[PDB]
Amino acid sequence: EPEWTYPRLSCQGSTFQKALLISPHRFGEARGNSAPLIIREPFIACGPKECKHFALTHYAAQPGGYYNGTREDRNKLRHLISVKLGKIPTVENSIFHMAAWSGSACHDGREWTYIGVDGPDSNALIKIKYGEAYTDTYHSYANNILRTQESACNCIGGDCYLMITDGSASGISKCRFLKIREGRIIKEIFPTGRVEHTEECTCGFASNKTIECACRDNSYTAKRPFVKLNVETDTAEIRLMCTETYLDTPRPDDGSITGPCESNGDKGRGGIKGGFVHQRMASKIGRWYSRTMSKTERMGMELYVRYDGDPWTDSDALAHSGVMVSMKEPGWYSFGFEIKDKKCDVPCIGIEMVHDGGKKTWHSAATAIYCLMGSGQLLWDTVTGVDMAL
Amino acid sequence: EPEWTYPRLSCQGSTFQKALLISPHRFGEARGNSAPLIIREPFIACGPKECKHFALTHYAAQPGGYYNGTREDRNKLRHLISVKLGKIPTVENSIFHMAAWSGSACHDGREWTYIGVDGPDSNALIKIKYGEAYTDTYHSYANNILRTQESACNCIGGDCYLMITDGSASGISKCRFLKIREGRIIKEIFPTGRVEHTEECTCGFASNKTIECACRDNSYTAKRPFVKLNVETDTAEIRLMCTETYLDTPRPDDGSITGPCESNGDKGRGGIKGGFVHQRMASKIGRWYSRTMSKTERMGMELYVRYDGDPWTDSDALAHSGVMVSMKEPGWYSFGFEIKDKKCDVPCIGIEMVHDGGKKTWHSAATAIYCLMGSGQLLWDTVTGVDMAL
Amino acid sequence: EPEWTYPRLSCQGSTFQKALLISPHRFGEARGNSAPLIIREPFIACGPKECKHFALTHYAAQPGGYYNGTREDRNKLRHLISVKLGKIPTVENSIFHMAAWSGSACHDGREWTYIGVDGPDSNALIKIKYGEAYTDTYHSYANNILRTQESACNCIGGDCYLMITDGSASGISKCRFLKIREGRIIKEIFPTGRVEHTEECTCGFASNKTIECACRDNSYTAKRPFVKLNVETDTAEIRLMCTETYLDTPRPDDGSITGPCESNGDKGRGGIKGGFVHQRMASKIGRWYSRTMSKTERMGMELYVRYDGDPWTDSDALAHSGVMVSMKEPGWYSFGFEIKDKKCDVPCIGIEMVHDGGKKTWHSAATAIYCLMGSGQLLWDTVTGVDMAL
Amino acid sequence: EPEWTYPRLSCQGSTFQKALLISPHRFGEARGNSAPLIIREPFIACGPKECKHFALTHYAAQPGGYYNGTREDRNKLRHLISVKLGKIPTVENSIFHMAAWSGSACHDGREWTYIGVDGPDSNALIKIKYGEAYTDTYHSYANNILRTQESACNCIGGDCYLMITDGSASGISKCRFLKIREGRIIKEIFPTGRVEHTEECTCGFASNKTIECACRDNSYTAKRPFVKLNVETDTAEIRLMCTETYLDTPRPDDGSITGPCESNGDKGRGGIKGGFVHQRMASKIGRWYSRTMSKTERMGMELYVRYDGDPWTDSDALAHSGVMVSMKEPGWYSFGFEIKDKKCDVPCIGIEMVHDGGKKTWHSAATAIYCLMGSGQLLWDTVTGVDMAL
Ligand SMILES: *[C@@H]1O[C@H](CO)[C@@H](O)[C@H](O)[C@H]1NC(C)=O
Ligand SMILES: *[C@@H]1O[C@H](CO)[C@@H](O)[C@H](O)[C@H]1NC(C)=O
Ligand SMILES: *[C@@H]1O[C@H](CO)[C@@H](O)[C@H](O)[C@H]1NC(C)=O
Ligand SMILES: *[C@@H]1O[C@H](CO)[C@@H](O)[C@H](O)[C@H]1NC(C)=O
Ligand SMILES: [Ca+2]
Ligand SMILES: [Ca+2]
Ligand SMILES: [Ca+2]
Ligand SMILES: [Ca+2]
Ligand SMILES: [Ca+2]
């Protein structure tokens, strides 16, 4: 059969560069003839030959008549959809995989696993699909919006790992990791460490033994919870990132949080899912991260790297590597993913750029992608080009 | 070349969950830009790698100008169409297979068999297509609307079995089974037993030896005719379901039909096609059924199960397993189908949710799917989200 | 490589039955959201696994703004297009093969040959395409609208035969047959016999040694020129069909043409391309033909068969086998084609049903298909269901 | 795995004929229902089985609201898109490959290499994609609009060659060639000879040893820079075409530039990308060229040929071979490409036909194709048929 996927060394390169904008609403004018779906929480996951661009649709198109409610997050109509990366996600181009108001997906080398959560807030359900077949579920353990990554899960040797979490958005949300093989949960992993609130983890492989994730604390800190999951022992520990370049939004000024690495700090309440991807070299590991340019709003997006060290203990600033989205443009969730080239993996970050005109009109998103490419420095930014009044 | 398909044991699970909603008219607004087809009698059938979503279209789209007559069942324009399950059935996504105002289709492991009936009421015709080729036909034997299942036919080892019936909707309709191999009828099966009215059979494999069907008696009873068809001797016998949980609509109160299992009881006139699917375990058989929440109108839909026993002799109430569609939402025809996972089969029930605003506007349907998935209880219901005035 | 196609015995059956309507303009309402192409001269040709539905488009859609000129036949914008049979031929579904105002195509078992004619009236050009590649041309020999079949060419052992003709529409048009192998003309065949006007031949295989064609005489007779082409010697002879059931339109009453078989008769001027397909049995040959129900207008379409005999000498009436299109509906060009089933060939006739509101509005066509299917008699007719004012 | 592609001998033929018109804006009427993309700089490139039709879109459709700015060349929204040749480039049919305001692409027998340039004018960037993976980049060396061919690159044995140039449009632009293997630049080639301005090279194989290109000098001359690139030593030399039939636009009268082949002459300022393709015979090489009918405006397009000789030293007029587009119709960029028949290659020229109504309306283009086909003379011209007011 195809053989199972493993992380490989990254393809050679030393800077990210603007790769692709998928801006569906450039075609949603009332006088045009297209039907872009109203979506949010996009992410991309790739298998050996193709990438799919996933998103959670409110099951409505622009132009159209169901804009009411599209700023909400959870309802009975939200579905996980995909298009091949490079296609515009329209009513006809999209595949509707399952009813879901939170999702993830990943390819294990042989088939796609799709993950979606739906159900009532106090009783939600993780649903897993392997190809066409619905294969397994996992129940709410804290009865308060069980939810998952909004980005790719990660498979190695056929075993796929997924972050899930449950609990109060302004309180405790202890995450768990599920180990999934061919659509079935074969193991629950309970992390150790600083565990009081971890959600929306962006995970990737640091090597064949470790998955690392930069996550969101929506309650206590502007530092990101950082998971190190050991794949050989199936154990996870979590501690806060110690860098002075806080990656959450909102956040205080860099370096202003005093005290040891684990200090929570100020402006911890609220948050945003953040980009994180690995560049695996033979002797050195690059960790690439994105954060909004505004400290308090979802506006702009800048790139940072750091090679080696230990995220849990290094307080050093990350090196700024370029403006992907200017302050003038929306920069909402971001996520990492890898494209498989013939012999190496290409790290990328994608950026959700939400068109927000509030609760009175449609609410949806463009997706911008930056990937490691060549050398020198990052050269250009992304605008969505959308005028919401059309 | 590909192996012939056989029924396998079902995948492990003990409850159904909400899987997917295909709701094409969420895109039919007169200010939108899409073309969902006007359809009724949807059903799904899967082969080893893919499922197709079939329906009978009135060869008209919403928005459009051909709404008049779309509530009627039989005319010269209806066609059997399909899209791959997960795509929205629009003008451009659909394949028009054949002219048909009643249909069925199944995959046998190597190719699709499509069945459609058309012709005048008094002298209609079963036409069979195998892949691209029209291959055989079967004539009306009672000259009163020859018609078939409106759901998947069933193949084992290259032989596909199909219910057909012919006769008065208010009187006698004796059904027959056809055994089809590579598109050509190789056998006609004349059932024994209680045969005065059987139509719209939903059938599946209880084992490699027996096909069972839960059917509609439109004249005499609210108990469903239940068929046991022995695939080895090609013989079939029919008797009424004895359970006090009557599955047809309209129906009397549960348990009010006194007398032996064969008493017809009251409010037998009228009916609805009902969902039915098997969960085949090594030692036991679960039979899952659906019926409307309302006793008299096509509103709501609830799930029921029974393990083992004999449907012909057990008067026991069936075990309620969850509300799939509430009473505020339409619940019209339902059907069972099975998805092929790698090593086991997944049972699902599909539900036609008709948007009915009477004869003065368009008339068409959404399809909701629930599949056996994990354990626990069924968690969420389905709404179409469609406003017919848009 | 795939092996070359040969004609096989026909699949068993004894009557034609309504198979499929492709009516694109059921979706062309000004208030709808679709783009059916404006087309005419449809035909279908099949290879081993699929059929394509071809047509000559005026390169315009309904609704739209280029209806002027769509009743003309020849201009600089007409193109040969195809969709997979069963799809609606819309702007997005269609493939544009080449610029052409007359066409043909056929599959030889390994690849598609496409044929289109364009160029000035007095100097037109046959262009041949094998797959994606343009491989050959043939020049006008009589300088007066070189043109070809408007239906499938026919391949045997890799050699594909095509009728072409050139000359006055109200005078002499001597046809030629080209023998084409992998897109290149390897032989010209000059027929013998009654040769003064032959155009729009509908050809098929009577066996592995003979191609027969029922053609159109636009100038001198309402009888059809009937070609017998010997594939082993690459020679052709033509004589008029002698049956009293004249197949052209316009035509005089049946049997009213006196004198020997080759007598031209009355009302010979004008004509229509006609359906003709073979049913090859081991000991008997059925020839199936269609003609309009009106003797003078393109309205209605009826089926006729005759088994064996010799079309050149038998004066016997053909046996009427059913009304495919009532007098009330358009019946314009018709054509034959065969669908390949696993072990036998299925004969069909398709009917162009043109929506004609004259020169002041759009002009386009639905395609109706009838195929040999089962036994008994033909049961239902086809309406397009199109209201041209919408 | 698939063999690497090499240039073969051309298929037999001696004249070009009209092959195909892709005219997407025949469907762009505000009362229609389609979404053709607004595009400029189309080109076509073929691999062994399929050709793709590429263009640079402004990420806007007709009808729509983003027409302003669609006449400008470089901005943050332009993307390289493709559709399979023969499909209309709409919103739903196109694949968005990468952000790019200048592009090229070629197939090497195993995979597609896509090249796009974006970034600010003073510091732009060549980005290369091989299949789905972003693989390499090349920096600006003269900091004045680094840019590439706007037509197919050329691969032999897995090595693909690409012209790039950087420099002032009014002065010096020294071009370079990149040698790319599986998406990564393995060699930079610095030409010799007359190198002061070479841009928009149309290149193809004269043999397995030489790539030749006919290019644009936008500052000094109306004679085209003509490149001979020796693929074995990876060296290139450039000299002006000596023919009195000057191929650029604007141009002086044919033969009015006196002096040696290298004299620049008059009306050198300005230019246009020109068509050029090879017909490789066993003993002789035909070089086919296109140029506008107008000497000063981008109207019309005519074909010219010359067999053998040396383009650098032959002052001979080229042989006129037919009017592909009359003077009433737009003739803007043109390019050559080759289709792969089974055993030989077919040369074609494509012509961009821009609908230009100035900066106050949409600006986009149709693509017309002429291919070597049979013998005789070129018979018909091409019109777009588009009314910009619709
Ligand atoms: C991971 O393991 C596989 C072998 O199991 C190996 O091919 C691959 O290179 C390893 N990945 C990395 C980054 O070391
Ligand atoms: C049915 O038979 C096939 C082989 O004939 C077997 O592999 C399959 O497991 C059997 N199914 C059941 C339900 O026993
Ligand atoms: C035609 O010839 C081939 C063998 O070359 C044979 O297989 C086929 O049956 C023949 N067709 C008919 C109708 O005899
Ligand atoms: C080029 O080389 C290939 C093999 O390397 C050969 O098959 C082909 O015919 C050659 N082409 C030309 C134009 O000589
Ligand atoms: Ca926070
Ligand atoms: Ca479409
Ligand atoms: Ca009943
Ligand atoms: Ca005539
Ligand atoms: Ca110039």
PDB file of N, CA, C and O and ligand atoms in Angstrom, chain B residues 216-225 248-251 266-272, ligand 7:
ATOM      1  N   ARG B 216     -43.604  -0.193   3.083  1.00  0.00           N
ATOM      2  CA  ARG B 216     -44.779   0.640   3.299  1.00  0.00           C
ATOM      3  C   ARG B 216     -46.031  -0.071   2.771  1.00  0.00           C
ATOM      4  O   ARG B 216     -45.985  -0.695   1.689  1.00  0.00           O
ATOM      5  N   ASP B 217     -47.092  -0.076   3.577  1.00  0.00           N
ATOM      6  CA  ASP B 217     -48.367  -0.598   3.160  1.00  0.00           C
ATOM      7  C   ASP B 217     -49.148   0.703   3.167  1.00  0.00           C
ATOM      8  O   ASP B 217     -49.364   1.350   4.203  1.00  0.00           O
ATOM      9  N   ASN B 218     -49.540   1.117   1.978  1.00  0.00           N
ATOM     10  CA  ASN B 218     -50.263   2.330   1.811  1.00  0.00           C
ATOM     11  C   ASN B 218     -51.766   2.154   1.937  1.00  0.00           C
ATOM     12  O   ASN B 218     -52.483   3.162   1.870  1.00  0.00           O
ATOM     13  N   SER B 219     -52.312   0.957   2.159  1.00  0.00           N
ATOM     14  CA  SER B 219     -53.780   0.861   2.218  1.00  0.00           C
ATOM     15  C   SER B 219     -54.367   0.334   3.509  1.00  0.00           C
ATOM     16  O   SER B 219     -55.343   0.850   4.034  1.00  0.00           O
ATOM     17  N   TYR B 220     -53.799  -0.749   3.990  1.00  0.00           N
ATOM     18  CA  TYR B 220     -54.361  -1.510   5.069  1.00  0.00           C
ATOM     19  C   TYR B 220     -53.783  -1.267   6.448  1.00  0.00           C
ATOM     20  O   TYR B 220     -54.521  -1.511   7.397  1.00  0.00           O
ATOM     21  N   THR B 221     -52.508  -0.843   6.638  1.00  0.00           N
ATOM     22  CA  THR B 221     -51.918  -0.872   7.977  1.00  0.00           C
ATOM     23  C   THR B 221     -50.761   0.126   8.132  1.00  0.00           C
ATOM     24  O   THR B 221     -50.250   0.713   7.138  1.00  0.00           O
ATOM     25  N   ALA B 222     -50.552   0.464   9.411  1.00  0.00           N
ATOM     26  CA  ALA B 222     -49.451   1.301   9.879  1.00  0.00           C
ATOM     27  C   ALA B 222     -48.294   0.448  10.414  1.00  0.00           C
ATOM     28  O   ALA B 222     -47.239   0.977  10.815  1.00  0.00           O
ATOM     29  N   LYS B 223     -48.489  -0.871  10.466  1.00  0.00           N
ATOM     30  CA  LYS B 223     -47.382  -1.758  10.755  1.00  0.00           C
ATOM     31  C   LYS B 223     -46.659  -1.868   9.412  1.00  0.00           C
ATOM     32  O   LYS B 223     -47.304  -1.730   8.346  1.00  0.00           O
ATOM     33  N   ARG B 224     -45.333  -2.033   9.380  1.00  0.00           N
ATOM     34  CA  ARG B 224     -44.610  -2.116   8.114  1.00  0.00           C
ATOM     35  C   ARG B 224     -44.544  -3.554   7.653  1.00  0.00           C
ATOM     36  O   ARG B 224     -44.203  -4.422   8.487  1.00  0.00           O
ATOM     37  N   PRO B 225     -44.837  -3.903   6.370  1.00  0.00           N
ATOM     38  CA  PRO B 225     -44.507  -5.232   5.799  1.00  0.00           C
ATOM     39  C   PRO B 225     -42.999  -5.473   5.933  1.00  0.00           C
ATOM     40  O   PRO B 225     -42.201  -4.569   5.627  1.00  0.00           O
ATOM     41  N   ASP B 248     -45.018   3.338  10.446  1.00  0.00           N
ATOM     42  CA  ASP B 248     -45.509   4.095   9.334  1.00  0.00           C
ATOM     43  C   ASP B 248     -46.084   5.435   9.785  1.00  0.00           C
ATOM     44  O   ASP B 248     -46.181   5.714  10.992  1.00  0.00           O
ATOM     45  N   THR B 249     -46.421   6.306   8.837  1.00  0.00           N
ATOM     46  CA  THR B 249     -47.105   7.542   9.127  1.00  0.00           C
ATOM     47  C   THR B 249     -48.203   7.676   8.083  1.00  0.00           C
ATOM     48  O   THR B 249     -47.857   7.743   6.899  1.00  0.00           O
ATOM     49  N   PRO B 250     -49.519   7.817   8.356  1.00  0.00           N
ATOM     50  CA  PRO B 250     -50.078   7.947   9.717  1.00  0.00           C
ATOM     51  C   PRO B 250     -50.067   6.653  10.485  1.00  0.00           C
ATOM     52  O   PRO B 250     -49.820   5.584   9.902  1.00  0.00           O
ATOM     53  N   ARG B 251     -50.195   6.779  11.793  1.00  0.00           N
ATOM     54  CA  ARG B 251     -50.271   5.624  12.648  1.00  0.00           C
ATOM     55  C   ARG B 251     -51.178   5.954  13.837  1.00  0.00           C
ATOM     56  O   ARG B 251     -51.362   7.128  14.161  1.00  0.00           O
ATOM     57  N   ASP B 266     -55.864   0.160  12.718  1.00  0.00           N
ATOM     58  CA  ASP B 266     -56.445   1.392  12.270  1.00  0.00           C
ATOM     59  C   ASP B 266     -55.470   2.388  11.666  1.00  0.00           C
ATOM     60  O   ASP B 266     -54.279   2.264  11.939  1.00  0.00           O
ATOM     61  N   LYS B 267     -55.926   3.409  10.925  1.00  0.00           N
ATOM     62  CA  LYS B 267     -55.113   4.405  10.233  1.00  0.00           C
ATOM     63  C   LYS B 267     -54.018   3.818   9.370  1.00  0.00           C
ATOM     64  O   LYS B 267     -52.880   4.294   9.281  1.00  0.00           O
ATOM     65  N   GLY B 268     -54.396   2.707   8.723  1.00  0.00           N
ATOM     66  CA  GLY B 268     -53.551   2.022   7.787  1.00  0.00           C
ATOM     67  C   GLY B 268     -53.404   2.730   6.455  1.00  0.00           C
ATOM     68  O   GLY B 268     -52.387   2.565   5.761  1.00  0.00           O
ATOM     69  N   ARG B 269     -54.369   3.548   6.110  1.00  0.00           N
ATOM     70  CA  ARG B 269     -54.350   4.236   4.839  1.00  0.00           C
ATOM     71  C   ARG B 269     -53.359   5.399   4.804  1.00  0.00           C
ATOM     72  O   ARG B 269     -53.387   6.275   5.669  1.00  0.00           O
ATOM     73  N   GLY B 270     -52.494   5.425   3.788  1.00  0.00           N
ATOM     74  CA  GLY B 270     -51.417   6.402   3.697  1.00  0.00           C
ATOM     75  C   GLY B 270     -50.133   5.681   4.121  1.00  0.00           C
ATOM     76  O   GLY B 270     -50.149   4.483   4.474  1.00  0.00           O
ATOM     77  N   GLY B 271     -49.006   6.369   4.090  1.00  0.00           N
ATOM     78  CA  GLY B 271     -47.767   5.805   4.533  1.00  0.00           C
ATOM     79  C   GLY B 271     -46.589   6.724   4.248  1.00  0.00           C
ATOM     80  O   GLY B 271     -46.701   7.835   3.689  1.00  0.00           O
ATOM     81  N   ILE B 272     -45.396   6.191   4.518  1.00  0.00           N
ATOM     82  CA  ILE B 272     -44.165   6.910   4.225  1.00  0.00           C
ATOM     83  C   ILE B 272     -43.055   5.854   4.094  1.00  0.00           C
ATOM     84  O   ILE B 272     -43.127   4.806   4.787  1.00  0.00           O
TER      85      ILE B 272
HETATM   86 CA    CA E   7     -49.979   2.712   5.929  1.00  0.00          CA
END
